[PDB]
Amino acid sequence: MDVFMKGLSKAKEGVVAAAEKTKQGVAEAAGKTKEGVLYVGSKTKEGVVHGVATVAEKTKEQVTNVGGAVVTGVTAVAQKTVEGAGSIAAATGFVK
Template identity: 65%
Template structure:
């Protein structure tokens, strides 16, 4: 009977030792898993922030290009309207064509072909 008790006691110690090692292994695995998840989360957050900043920068660049194009287009329309108005004023005789060219410097003289 003593032999059986001694055998069971040794087996019990073995099971306890195995349980301790398993517990330590699980705790270590959990810590490593947590560390890995935190790392991935941090990298994902950095990636999202970087992507948002890149998109914001590209959007700003595109908005600037559109704004510059709109201003250039508006300036062109304004210049053409001014040229057309000067031609109409000069051709109707409301203003002397010589005065228009003196004051503006860039106005074209209308032809007298229609008069």
């Protein structure tokens, strides 16, 4: 069972260059990501929201958030005169 290899697997005489995802100037709220996840035989239960019972009587104002994740803020980003953040991979093999 061979999974998520980067580079030579069961292999020979090889040259491999792998970059990887860059991020610059990114604003995220309540995001979910899953990379390289393996489930074998497993039993899994995620994110269930059950039985929210918001009630109100006669109130003048009312706000309610129920979530696996709640963001109500300000998440600004500002940049002036910025360079770089790049990812570089260089591989050299078997030259003469």
